[PDB]
A paper describes a structure:
In an attempt to obtain such “snapshots” of biantennary N-glycan, we selected for crystallographic studies two unrelated plant lectins, Calsepa from Calystegia sepium and [name]-E from [name], which show 4- to 5-fold increase in affinity toward bisected biantennary N-glycans compared with control non-bisected glycan. The most populated conformation of bisected N-glycan is termed the ‘back-fold’ conformation, in which the α1–6 arm is flipped back towards the stem region of N-glycan (GlcNAcβ1–4GlcNAc). In summary, our study provides the first atomic structures of a flipped-back conformation of bisected N-glycan bound to two specific lectins. Thus both proteins, [name]-E as well as Calsepa, are specifically ‘back-fold conformer selective’, rather than broad bisecting GlcNAc-selective lectins.
[name]-E is a legume lectin (120 kDa as tetramer) which is widely used for detecting bisected glycans. Unfortunately, electron density was observed for only two sugar residues from one branch, which made it impossible to decipher the conformation of the whole glycan. We have now determined the crystal structure of [name]-E in complex with a longer bisected N-glycan derivative (glycan 2 in Fig. 4A) at 3.0 Å resolution. Eight [name]-E subunits and eight bisected glycan molecules are packed in the asymmetric unit. [name]-E forms a tetramer and each monomer binds to one bisected glycan in its primary binding site. The structure contains eight carbohydrate residues out of ten. The α1–6 branch and bisecting GlcNAc interact with [name]-E, while the α1–3 branch and chitobiose unit are exposed to solvent. The only hydrogen bonds are between two hydroxyl groups, OH3 and OH4 of GlcNAc-7 and the side chain of Asp122 in the loop B region. The putative H2 and H4 hydrogen atoms of GlcNAc-7 can make van der Waals contact with H1, H3 and H5 hydrogen atoms of GlcNAc-5 of the α1–3 branch. Moreover, the nitrogen atom of GlcNAc-5′ in the α1–6 branch is located within hydrogen bond distance of OH3 of GlcNAc-2 in the chitobiose unit. As in the case of Calsepa, the back-fold conformation appears critical for simultaneous recognition of both the α1–6 branch and GlcNAc-7.
Author numbering:
A (entry chain B), B (entry chain D), C (entry chain C), D (entry chain A): 22 to 259
The structure:
Amino acid sequence: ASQTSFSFQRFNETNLILQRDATVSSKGQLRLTNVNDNGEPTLSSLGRAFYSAPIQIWDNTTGAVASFATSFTFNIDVPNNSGPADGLAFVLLPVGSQPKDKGGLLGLFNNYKYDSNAHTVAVEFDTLYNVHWDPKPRHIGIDVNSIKSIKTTTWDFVKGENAEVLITYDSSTKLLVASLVYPSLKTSFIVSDTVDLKSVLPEWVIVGFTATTGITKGNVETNDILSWSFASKLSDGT
Amino acid sequence: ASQTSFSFQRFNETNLILQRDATVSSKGQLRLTNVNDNGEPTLSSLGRAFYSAPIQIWDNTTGAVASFATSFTFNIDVPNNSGPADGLAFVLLPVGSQPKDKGGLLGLFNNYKYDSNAHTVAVEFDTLYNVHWDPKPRHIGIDVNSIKSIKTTTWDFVKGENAEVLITYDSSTKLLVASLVYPSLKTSFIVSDTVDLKSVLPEWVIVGFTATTGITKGNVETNDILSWSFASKLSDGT
Amino acid sequence: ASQTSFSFQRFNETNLILQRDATVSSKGQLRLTNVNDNGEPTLSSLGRAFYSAPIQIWDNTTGAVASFATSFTFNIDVPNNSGPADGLAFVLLPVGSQPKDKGGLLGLFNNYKYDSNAHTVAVEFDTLYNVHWDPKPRHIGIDVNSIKSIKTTTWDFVKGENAEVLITYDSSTKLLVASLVYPSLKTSFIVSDTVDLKSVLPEWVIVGFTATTGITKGNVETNDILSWSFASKLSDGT
Amino acid sequence: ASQTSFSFQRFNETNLILQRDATVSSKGQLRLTNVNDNGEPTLSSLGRAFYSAPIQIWDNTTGAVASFATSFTFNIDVPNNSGPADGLAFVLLPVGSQPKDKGGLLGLFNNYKYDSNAHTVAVEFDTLYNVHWDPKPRHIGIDVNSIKSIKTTTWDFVKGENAEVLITYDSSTKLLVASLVYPSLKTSFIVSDTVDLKSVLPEWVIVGFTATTGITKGNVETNDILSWSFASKLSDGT
Ligand SMILES: [Ca+2]
Ligand SMILES: [Ca+2]
Ligand SMILES: [Ca+2]
Ligand SMILES: [Ca+2]
Ligand SMILES: [Mn+2]
Ligand SMILES: [Mn+2]
Ligand SMILES: [Mn+2]
Ligand SMILES: [Mn+2]
């Protein structure tokens, strides 16, 4: 009834809305945070990227909510004598949404309080423990209007390893499932919770990614997206 | 490898680039040319509509060309005591492409001469005979860099009836096939001819529609798109 | 809701139901009629190949009818000093159906009268004119329980040239559309009419091909399928 | 190049190969193991069901391996005064494969030893702990030519609840991933390992399910499949 799907092996900036430090390298890689000339990630970075066509997530007339699935391969690497920070997230935001506060707030919030008017659904890949909200181990978290996830799962983060993610949303069950696998480590992690899109997001949203590096020294990482697939389906009724 | 596909039964301006007279009605119909308050098509009208995300048609490195297919339902109506003009088209144009001269040039050209710098591939639905270039009967025609179509086929145009269009392009054979059916009238029409996309179109193009009304009194039509689907695949090689 | 689609560039007998003279050559070609060791087609040959899984076309409980589409590439060649006969057809038949009479009856019917107990929907590619029912020119026809097509269209048959075919059925409008293209000759043909599947076919059917060579010397051809794609969708109401 | 996908919300025997106790109920549920007239599952049952068309997993000429995905929703329920047993499994088996020993071997193996001639890849959902090979808690397992799974993960089995299963296989990484979600409980589980299809399975296989009930009083369950989707893709090279 209304179908959108896109699939990219290599990125080009032509069909993307890049914000802040988010660039497209000559290799075709979506490098969300800054990396200098020597192949080294820099501190205090922030970058967001989006598919240039907004997607309809729901319709107020019909009452219908879209089911969507997305899959992406990312590489987060850390230079020597450093820990990682701060991570990356897949997001659904209002059209023309502008970057927020850097570091641990991932460019999505300005504080660690809940914001009913944030209109933000995100699946986070956290690489840093923030004492005021995060669980102690590194995690995958579902974020609904807060940096303090509604549900998390332990993620055994390993630097330099390609990570293959699948995020699915079934509107009939309201279940958002997110999974990560490391093909070389053969490891796998999954998290799931119910999210009521209709009450959180606007009818039209932009889809894509956001990443930030740490502000303190010794906490930094690359945040590269290597491939992306997205598909949503919204029923209007023949 | 690089897949893109979208399908709409109702239109909204949120995921479209609209140009000149093109509007989306409150019913959810992409109305390309101007219509006054009484539902009457107006003369000298030109409108263009595009999907907000550009599509990649070929790659310079890999040398590959995309295959694409598009289907849509259009309704051309003509008011009483008038004839039809000038027709509408499915178009592939450069990113940021601006409208051209109106009338029987369908907003794609400034004259009826070949123009290698036009970078224009279009499937036209011609409702008015232009002495200088068109065949006499109303026709479906394949346009490559010129309003004089490289091939045409007789289209028995009937006003106010829904026409269902399928346009397919095989890159392996370079064949562009365009067909039209009136599900009520049970009539079908088809035209096919070779097009080399690599030599005519830039790597990245916008996809969508153009339409114009007649400039002389007695020649005018509505140019409405009711539903639209598009899909294109481009191989990179894993 | 109930979706089935397949696509084969190369054929193998493992997933097909072959009948009579139908064979899969060592190249991966579906050779519907018989060909000797010299590479010559034999007279009075009959073959039929189907997909090994039956497909649901309609539901008696919901009343819902499937929308389907099939696309394939066939090669019909005529040896020296001969005419072409009789043709091949894409068919929908009851599960477990047996071959019928050969010749200008394409292995589908016993006679050239209408038969409501036949349960046969077919798109024919008729190369030989049969005085008793066919039109004089070579044609594409839509067969419903009779070899006398309900609708036909002229087909400029050329031997030894690859022919790409698209057959689409839309249950909302009950319209069946059939087109043929010759990629190298740039020629194209189309035929369309409505068909009420709900009254003709059983709920479950088999899909595939049927072919025959002529019974009289100097009237023979090859009937080959080089690739096949099929898709059908059937709503049940979530 | 060679693609097959199918999707069913209701079942019918027409397009499935049923073995032993496997039955398709009036409600349209694939009931793998036997259920008496009260609703009670019976002891020592075995049932297997398969899609009628065989699926090609690899080609010996090109050496190419297929990537496949499958999702199903199953229901396992236990009658009062009993524990569960023995489980159900999604399987890939050689064409014409016949059921093996019942009980904890799930109708795939004759003992609990590795058998290279088994030609059996299966994702199990084990509800009964077997001292000689199983991990203590109820698990999801990846089986390769042996009931002793190459990798497992704890699965918190809850009777009576619909479970949604996704199984993906990427032929480039040789990685198989299997996940289970309980939509109503919001719980979710995942496991992944490498499997070399080319060396284990034959060119063509039948895809589907197998299930067994316990041989000892007090250990029994229903093994119901409520919906099924399967997709595979094998590249010949254009
Ligand atoms: Ca954090
Ligand atoms: Ca004209
Ligand atoms: Ca004939
Ligand atoms: Ca067990
Ligand atoms: Mn966190
Ligand atoms: Mn024209
Ligand atoms: Mn005929
Ligand atoms: Mn086990």
